[PDB]
Symmetry: C3
Subunit: 425 residues, 3 copies
């Protein structure tokens, strides 16, 4: 493959603890993008020459570092009321003073788990013969609005407080052994006689991503990745507008284990009934729409029960290596790529998080990186030797695509035309 | 200009595919801040010496990577009601069972686009002669609260799911040709005989920026950058508390194309009228306050119809280059700057996103970077040769500014005094 | 200490302004993690050899770059009402038209700061003898719901719009002088005869952190770090659901200096009283739970009255240096560490922002970096020579810990067993 990646080569004197000093060769690879691979040939002065040491970055991924978790139900709004004339039942003298948001009337008809999350009260109703009462003073309306979880469906929700880079590299030793591993950052690792490699860290050009949260439906394990509320903040209109501290608490939305804002349910008292209004957000609908694998604005998120993100523009992440070699000379194998191509389609949505699909047929003499810069967006992707079609996603702002793009594949540049039609949503 | 920027210079043997091996000179520039420029002199063994290759970073900017878009109206709250005695009109037997949140009474007086977003209902009202009715049973109050867009003003809102770095570099070839371009990351670009340059990527020291969204007023194109709701989440108190899927849907806030939380409008039924309460957030007021260009906490945001951010502290972003040279010797031109200065003013706000303005008159023998570290904040900016006044922004926490600051300009350090007075908001 | 950190060493020709050209030695340290230290020995051709120049990264921290600030009260909900028969008091002809959300009834009993934030109104009540009135037409209910701050407790809230890296380095000159400083990024600093050092910047592998806000209780100075609302957006369920523009405005929640959503307080009118509902979020409770120092998902936040964050995985931040040396030879002192250890405990919470505590006893021949990779999480920490116990935090997803972990300490790897039990919350 033989990418040009070694950008410094040095000979330093290194000493242990009199003193024991010797010459160390060192080769610095400041920036290696996913898919790229270097080929390093070591020969001792006596020689011949080894097959090369190959150093490839397979991927540099984003791992979710979680905030505290909580559980959410698929909640449904319910309301009930019963009216008692003054001097009847509890209404001996108007609304009884104790009857408050945790109170339950025995006169109630509907589903009343007395342990469920909700809000009760009692209100004045009309009295007199006109409203079916002997006593003309106001009647009592004992009412409750609450939420239940009839489907027993529950999601564990874990906000991603940040994402952390995690590299996977692939090394081919001159013996031919292939090693695929997450390296230990900053620790020189002896690979074979006289040669050690240090992974010096990963870097990313993507700043301040939007807050996303892992969702896992319990007892089905199916995952989603979507916005959610901070733990303990029951803000209406989001996953997490109801939050529970256990699976069972969420299954039955228990008052003692769940929080909410009671305005999620509206109740309208009428003389002889009540009208219920749901302002609830369907958790199920959000998870349906947000299933993994998903492309969200330049990053593909996928599941291993942990979620990781892969930047789609592979030139926006890189890893750095240092190679030391003792008593050996280094030669680099470096070759340019012959690569040409044409766009065969653009299709999809505009002003959408997925971005449109750009279909690009390329022929390439070796594995390399394709770059596509348009006026709306720009991206890069790995290209395989031979002739193949690639479908990177790119973001456009309008239904009509008709613009100049520049394709750069292995240093060869051409001005392609992108034309197509895209939908909203 | 001649900044010290080449921090490694090497001579490696590079080979193609027997084998064809030759010596490649390589120069690594690990970190170049905006405004900085290197000067590289190449001479062949026979010589004289070329004018230099100049490599300057013009800017490293943040480009908005959008989430899905939506449209928002400048919404205004409306309410209406009509009361019908029992046995009159629809109220033949109390509130009719069908009359619900999408129902419209023909008895209504006010603006009723039956396609608009809103919520209807009917409620019991007082009956009898005391409330103007023959029948003593409860009357019916048919009511609706809704939102309209009388100004027809609409903004397209595009949340920025993340920001991505984008570099602009300026190269001066020994021939004197100046090239200003966004380079292709990771691809060696042949510049002139024997010399190629690779841009190895950009890096930024600013972590996890606050969520901002592009706003564009339709039919005026004027832009703003401000917080907003995630698409599909109609959280009250934010741009995006009402969201529409098209311009026309937003112009007339259509029920079929818009979402909201109906608690954005309050209605109070009285016997013979209703009181309307608006809890709406003015979109216009947010966009007014959030016009581009804007400084938001260390980053200047500006328009090209796309928005980009420029870190104001120019030492917090950098680009990395590698230069290869074949059959040539390299010499670096590097000069230090003579530079002194004094603070002439500090004015503005404290505890504000803009930060205060610090006025600094500097004299400098060459283009260089000024650094100002204070106890409250710290920044750096590009400085031009000659005598000029600069106005970097810095953040303070109190109305009274009276503190030690250190000014570093081209390696020369001095302890300046910052004194001034600032306002809240 | 003698870490392997110099990964390039070069000899370039550098020229001033005929021309004055000379040879400059340069040593590049691409990536130095906190706790690591290099030892550089300079000898002039005549020699002996200096004690070394030591270059250590003490810390690379995250500094909060603030949005605009605001003040929040510890708010408490209040309600009052008074009912006047028709033809009595203001109720001469029903609810008076002027009586609206800023109106105050002189008939009111409760705490009425007429300058406080709140919402008034008047509503129809029942008339006639049945409701204590001679006139049978509807009575008037004059009511108000508002918020007060009885404790006078106020927090200044400053959202962190982003976090910026700030490095502290420690240099030991051959003379033995120790210098601890924040370096000036990108400026070559002359250290001693012939030697200068450039700090080339900091880098971090943590992307897009969750929005946090500094909180400072006024008149106590005690700090917290917690989510909050954007300035000017009074979204219910968060710190900042009530926002004030001054300390005094927050102390008494003045209408002219504070904003809110009036649905934070509910009022239910009954015939002869009103029921008050608080939907307020206790600011005090959030600050209590969010006190500094706090570990939030991989970062320890601590106070200097400014807050800074320290990444706990020290291999996820690094600094870069360049050293120039004039007329001298360089030798590197580099030694590997002997280091072994065992896990002695894991205790704490799962699916929590703190993460569990893993207790690790290590013996090490020198200061070095310990790395612990488990299936749930992975971290690294600084290790001191000798035998010591370390307690890095790691995130697990389940109450039962029983998994393979790999410990890497100075290049020595061992597969440890992690077993323990953790709680939710
Ligand atoms: C050339 O690239 C192939 C990989 O293509 C995949 O798509 C690329 C565009 C990019 O996305 C890359 O990340 C992908 O891996 C390599 O072959 C594949 O290697 C994977 C191992 O992960 C293996 O599962 C596939 O079967 C294999 N063949 C395919 C996809 O047709 C080539 O890798 C070399 O050749 C392979 C046969 C194997 O020996 C591998 O270890 C070698 O690196 C790439 N060519 C070269 C010369 O590297
Ligand atoms: C010295 O810097 C000038 C630029 O000043 C601007 O402000 C700086 C403090 C910093 O913000 C920088 O980003 C700005 O560009 C250069 O001159 C300007 O170059 C721009 C090109 O972008 C041009 O539009 C201006 O007319 C020009 N003159 C000004 C602003 O007075 C100097 O650049 C060199 O000289 C120019 C005449 C041009 O030949 C340019 O290509 C050269 O780089 C800077 N001096 C040197 C020696 O580089
Ligand atoms: C070995 O590390 C000691 C520091 O340990 C602390 O914990 C580490 C695991 C890591 O978290 C690190 O950041 C911490 O500083 C050093 O000694 C300490 O140095 C600090 C100065 O910040 C000082 O306050 C302590 O008293 C001191 N001794 C302790 C904690 O026992 C060693 O530093 C060297 O030796 C010191 C005596 C001092 O001369 C210092 O300047 C030296 O660097 C570290 N050893 C070596 C050889 O560097």
């Amino acid at each position: 493959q033989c990418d040009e990646l070694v950008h410094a080569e040095s000979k330093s004197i290194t000493c242990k603890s009199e003193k024991e000093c010797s010459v160390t060769g060192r080769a610095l690879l400041p920036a290696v993008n996913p898919g790229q691979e270097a080929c390093l040939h070591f020969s001792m002065p006596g020689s011949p020459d080894s097959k090369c040491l190959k150093i490839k970055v397979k991927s540099i991924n984003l791992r979710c570092k979680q905030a505290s978790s909580y559980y959410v139900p698929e909640a449904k709004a319910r309301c009930t009321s019963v009216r008692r004339c003054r001097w009847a039942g509890d209404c001996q003298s108007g609304c009884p003073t104790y009857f408050s948001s945790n109170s339950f009337s025995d006169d109630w008809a509907n589903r009343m788990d007395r342990a469920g999350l909700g809000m009760s009260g009692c209100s004045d109703g009309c009295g007199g013969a006109a409203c079916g009462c002997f006593n003309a003073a106001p009647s009592c309306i004992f009412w409750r609005k609450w939420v239940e979880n009839p489907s027993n469906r529950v999601w564990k929700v874990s906000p991603c407080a940040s994402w952390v880079l995690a590299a996977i590299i692939e090394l081919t030793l001159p013996s031919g052994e292939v090693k695929t591993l997450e390296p230990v950052t900053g620790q020189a690792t002896q690979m074979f006689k006289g040669v050690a490699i240090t992974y010096l860290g990963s870097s990313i050009e993507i700043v301040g991503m939007t807050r996303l949260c892992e969702m896992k439906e319990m007892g089905t394990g199916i995952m989603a990745l979507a916005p959610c509320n901070d733990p303990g903040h029951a803000i209406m209109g989001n996953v997490g507008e109801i939050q529970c501290s256990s699976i069972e608490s969420a299954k039955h939305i228990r008052s003692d284990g769940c929080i909410w804002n009671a305005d999620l349910v509206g109740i309208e008292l009428r003389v002889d009934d009540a009208v219920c209004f749901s302002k609830l957000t369907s958790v199920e609908a959000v998870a349906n729409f947000s299933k993994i694998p998903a492309i969200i604005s330049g990053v593909r998120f996928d599941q291993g029960s942990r979620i990781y993100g892969s930047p789609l523009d592979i030139t926006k992440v890189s890893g750095e290596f240092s190679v030391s070699f003792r008593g050996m000379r280094l030669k680099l194998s470096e070759i340019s790529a012959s690569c040409t191509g044409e766009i065969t389609n653009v299709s999809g949505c505009y002003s959408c998080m997925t971005g449109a699909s750009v279909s690009i047929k390329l022929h390439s003499s070796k594995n390399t990186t394709g770059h596509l810069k348009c006026d709306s967006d720009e991206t890069a992707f790995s290209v395989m030797e031979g002739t193949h079609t690639y479908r990177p996603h790119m973001s456009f702002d309008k239904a009509v695509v008709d613009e100049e793009c520049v394709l750069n594949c292995g240093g060869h540049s051409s001005k392609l035309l992108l034309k197509g039609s895209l939908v909203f949503m």
